[PDB]
Amino acid sequence: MQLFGGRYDFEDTEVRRSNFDNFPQALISVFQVLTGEDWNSVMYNGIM
């Protein structure tokens, strides 16, 4: 939430549901990085 919270403001219309905008959402995103599924695209949205 500190690093990526409020920073996924990409101007395109692609939907990025795994973000860190509130606490339940950040919790779901960290759980998804832990199960390992699609963690790389969470990383790419965080790099961009």
Partner: protein, 973 residues
């Protein structure tokens, strides 16, 4: 350097030679004599200018009244027919049969989608619509992304089916009617007569984006004018998708505004500021909206939100009353995402009494809270909208006009007044039209005080088109000289009718696209704006024309004679003429009609040929076979009879006209016998001149051709081997040299075009021309223009006989008023004949402008075409320049110093023509130069709109305003 008297003698001999050659070899005096020797084949009739304007003003009033009658018929039948509709929901059994425009008609398809049944029409071809049209039924347009098959749509095609009988009756009583349309508030458009749409969505590859609700005529008849303020949130929270959507949304919202609305876009994040250069409400014309759109596209998002500051700013903007406004519908449009504050203090302070509406838009997909802004909307008589995507924008930014129309519905029959739009271009390719509109009301449970729930909105707008060529048929221009004309005016400045109004869009700024970001097959959007050309941007502007304009914007009658600069047909020259403007108001409307007549055009010739003998002889004179005795003959492609139509292949038209004048008697059962009688008279005269005079000397020394161009519409070019070098218009009212030679009292030289693809320097020659002017009974008339082409080489060898061919000590040129090169001295100058002198010697030309031997005037053309720069052809503004003589002195001696050099020069104006002879020290002595001086359409962007807004043109607003009914509901928000 030769003395003053030697140069004076040289130019006096030169002009003696030129003028005597043109005078004796064109035949001016001979034609004057044959015009005055008859005096009994014709009569000289007066052009009463005040009677003409009033006749034409009544004909225009009668046309618009005949159209206002056919709208009141449609609206009453539509109201009565919807009041008695049942609201079915089971159409799969009882079909709706209708003709959907924009479906393909090859009978192997057989769609007939559920609940409805299709119609296949017959589609005869027509005139007055240049397309295939069916007078049997109406066509229906449904926007592409509106499913037909809906219960809303099918309940609409069911009761609008009773319109076709009034459509048919309207057209049966006035066979000269164009489109009649009902635009529905559900998106439908039912028009008559039926005709396939211009663009189908899937037929080809270009998706049609036409929705009635965004059309200027619909928006005009749906609600009253507006004082809109757009308040855009640029706090940090809107960053990302919702900011991009907000920018697209604000541009779409600006596109629903016209010239009777006033707008400004502000912005707030912990501080409120104007988004632009504007600082108050501005008139919302195409230029101001361009400024606002380009300022909105530069918006970024950073900061904290403060609804109180933004709303204080907005309410203070809506309270100026120092600037021009509408004074009608004060509304705020807040584009935001979500917030926590509802700002009750500011509303209690600033619209205690709720005179300003508030429409809030929540844009994007965010998690923020929307309660506050729904409250802002529901409290201040406004409305609340959600825009989640791009595909949601168009419909949500055009729907606020239902809320604005409630106080117009509650007014009843006081609010059913016909209105006419600006000039726009028909969406079915009919050219330039105005549309007269009328709102239709929902009256169910009206005779019983029942419903009043769905009944606060309108059902749609009825519209009826009027093409500007119907209005040009009531202001006929063939008894005024080519220099007189009619023109009409809005109570807004804009022009309804003018020579210089073309069917092209108005250009704004400089056109620039990005060629590296254009997919090949994605169907660009085109346009929706009107052709709003102010009166002072169609002509050259004095101080007297401004007060004439202001005077007939305030519906005044009047008359005024003055002296003005007139630009030439080809925008290269400027003449000074005396003109008379005589104006009057069109009584039923807010238009004003004026007639411009140049004195010398107060009398015309009416033909009086009433025996068959001479009529028949004259008709024989214009037959292709005998061209070799009358010279190649052109005929003006007018409408002499209702049958023969203008062909644009002029030999085809001449053949048709001959076939017609002899196959049907000169009794002329249904033709315009006045035009035909005048053409016959003028052909007789021109042929007498060609025979008795031009044939006696089959060739002259330097004369390359000879021509007469008369009114009536006859052109004759004597050696037919010149007849195909003649590239002028065959319509003698669009010939630039004709209109220029009418303005001057002397010989007018026309410069050829330079670097033009075709015969243009030594093949054709240099055109001289002079207007034949006669006195019948003490009255001046200029019915024709004689002329000549001069051979370049003969002129050169009379010109050299201390400058001789390729002298390198000095230059001798001959220019005309306009600064175009005619007779040089250097054989590399004479290679560019017809070129602007400031482009082949810029230093001396700038100095001549400085000495004031040349003046100039600059203008803007707002309908120009440009090849776009990097940042087909699009529409642009271009700046035009025209040079002319101001001072009346014959000689100008002097010495131009470049610094380190000094070229001595002497220019002398040739008397009795429009020529100037310049003798200057040579140029290749001292390498001094600065830069070319161009006289050409230069693509521009100005004038600066941030300054026109501070001092704007005078204007008159509509005085009817329907806002603020107290019986309004605003429980819907």
């Amino acid at each position: 350097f030769p003395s003053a008297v030697t140069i004076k003698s040289w130019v006096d001999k030169m002009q003696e030679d030129l003028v005597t050659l043109a005078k004796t070899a064109s035949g001016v005096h001979q034609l004057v004599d044959i015009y005055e020797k008859y005096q009994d084949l014709y009569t000289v009739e007066p052009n009463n200018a005040r009677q003409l304007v009033e006749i034409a003003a009544r004909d225009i009033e009668k046309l618009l009244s005949n159209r206002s009658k056919a709208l009141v018929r449609l609206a009453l039948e539509a109201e009565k027919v919807q009041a008695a509709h049942q609201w079915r929901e089971d159409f799969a059994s009882n079909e709706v049969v209708y003709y959907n425009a924009k479906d393909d008609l090859d009978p192997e398809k057989n769609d007939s989608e559920p609940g409805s049944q299709r119609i296949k029409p017959v589609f005869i071809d027509d005139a007055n619509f240049r397309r295939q049209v069916s007078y049997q039924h109406a066509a229906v347009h449904i926007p592409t992304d509106i499913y037909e098959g809906s219960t809303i749509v099918l309940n609409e095609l069911n009761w609008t089916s009773a319109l076709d009988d009034v459509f048919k009756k309207n057209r049966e009583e006035d066979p000269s009617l164009l489109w009649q349309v009902f635009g529905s508030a559900t998106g439908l458009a039912r028009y008559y007569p039926a005709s396939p749409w211009v663009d189908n969505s899937r037929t080809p590859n270009k998706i049609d984006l036409y929705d009635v609700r965004r059309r200027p005529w619909y928006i005009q008849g749906a609600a009253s004018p507006k004082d809109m303020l757009i308040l855009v949130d640029v706090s940090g929270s809107v960053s990302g998708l919702t900011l991009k959507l907000i920018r697209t949304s604000v541009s779409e919202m600006l596109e629903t505004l016209s010239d009777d609305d006033f707008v400004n876009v502000a912005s707030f994040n912990s501080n409120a500021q104007d988004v632009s250069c504007f600082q108050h409400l501005v008139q919302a014309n195409v230029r101001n909206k361009k400024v606002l759109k380009d300022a909105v596209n530069n918006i970024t998002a950073k900061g904290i939100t403060d609804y109180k500051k933004g709303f204080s700013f907005a309410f203070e903007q809506l309270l100026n009353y120092n600037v021009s406004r509408a004074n009608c519908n004060k509304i705020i449009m807040l584009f935001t995402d979500g917030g926590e504050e509802r700002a009750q203090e500011i509303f209690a302070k600033y619209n205690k009494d709720k005179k300003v509406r508030v429409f809030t838009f929540s844009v994007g997909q965010h998690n923020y809270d929307r309660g506050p802004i729904q409250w802002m909307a529901c409290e201040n008589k406004g409305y609340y909208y959600e825009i989640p995507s791009i595909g949601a924008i168009r419909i949500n930014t055009q729907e606020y006009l239902d809320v604005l129309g409630r106080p117009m519905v509650l007014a009843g029959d006081k609010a059913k007044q016909v209105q006419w739009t600006n000039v726009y271009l028909d969406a079915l390719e009919l050219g330039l039209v105005i549309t007269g509109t009328l709102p239709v009301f929902n009256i169910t449970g009206q005779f019983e005080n029942k419903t009043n729930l769905k009944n606060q909105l309108i059902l749609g707008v009825m519209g009826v088109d009027v093409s500007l060529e119907d209005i040009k048929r009531l202001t006929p221009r063939f008894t005024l000289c080519p220099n007189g004309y009619y023109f009409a005016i809005d109570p807004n400045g804009y022009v309804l009718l003018h020579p210089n109004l073309q069917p092209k869009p108005i250009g704004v700024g400089i056109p620039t696209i990005n060629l590296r970001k254009r997919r090949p097959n994605v169907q660009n959007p085109k346009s929706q704006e009107p052709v709003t050309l102010d009166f002072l941007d169609a002509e050259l502007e004095n101080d007297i024309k401004v007060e004439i304009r202001n005077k007939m914007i305030d519906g005044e009658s009047g008359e005024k004679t003055f002296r003005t600069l007139v630009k030439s047909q080809d925008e290269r020259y400027i003449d000074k003429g005396n003109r008379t403007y005589t104006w009057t108001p069109v009584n039923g409307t807010d238009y004003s009609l004026a007639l411009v007549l140049p004195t010398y055009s107060f009398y015309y010739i009416k033909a009086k040929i009433e025996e068959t003998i001479t009529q028949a002889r004259y008709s024989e004179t214009l037959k292709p076979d005998n061209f070799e005795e009358s010279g190649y003959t052109f005929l003006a492609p007018r409408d002499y009879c209702s049958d023969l139509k203008p062909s644009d292949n002029n030999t085809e038209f001449l053949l048709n006209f001959n076939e017609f004048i002899d196959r049907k008697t000169p009794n002329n059962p249904s033709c315009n016998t006045d035009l035909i009688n005048r053409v016959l008279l003028d052909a007789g005269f021109t042929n007498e001149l060609v025979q008795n005079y031009w044939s006696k000397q089959k060739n002259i020394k330097g004369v390359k051709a000879r021509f007469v161009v008369t009114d009536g519409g006859i052109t004759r070019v004597y050696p037919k081997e010149a007849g195909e070098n003649w590239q002028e218009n065959p319509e003698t009212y669009e010939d630039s040299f004709y209109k220029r030679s009418l303005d001057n009292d002397n010989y007018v030289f026309t410069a050829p075009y330079f670097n033009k693809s075709g015969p243009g320097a030594y093949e054709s020659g240099i055109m001289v021309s002079k207007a034949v002017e006669i006195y019948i009974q003490g009255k001046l008339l200029k019915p024709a223009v004689v002329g000549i082409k001069i051979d370049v080489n003969s002129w050169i060898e009379n010109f050299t006989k201390d400058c001789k061919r390729n002298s390198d000590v000095m230059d001798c040129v001959i220019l005309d008023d306009g600064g175009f090169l005619l007779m040089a001295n250097h054989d590399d100058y004479t290679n560019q004949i017809g070129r602007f002198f400031g482009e082949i010697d810029p230093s001396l030309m700038r100095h001549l402008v400085n000495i004031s031997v040349y003046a100039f005037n600059k203008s803007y053309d707002y309908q120009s075409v440009c090849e776009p720069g990097a940042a087909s052809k699009q529409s642009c503004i271009t700046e035009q320049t025209q040079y002319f003589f101001d001072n009346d002195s014959k000689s100008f001696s002097g010495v131009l110093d470049c610094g380190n050099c000094s070229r001595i020069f002497h220019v002398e104006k040739l008397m009795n023509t429009n020529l100037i002879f310049i003798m200057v020290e040579s140029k290749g002595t001292c390498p001094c130069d600065t830069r070319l001086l161009i006289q050409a359409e230069q693509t521009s962007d100005g004038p600066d709109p941030c300054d026109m807004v501070k001092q704007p043109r005078y204007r008159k607003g509509p005085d009817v305003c329907f806002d603020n009914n107290v019986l309004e509901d605003y429980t819907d928000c």
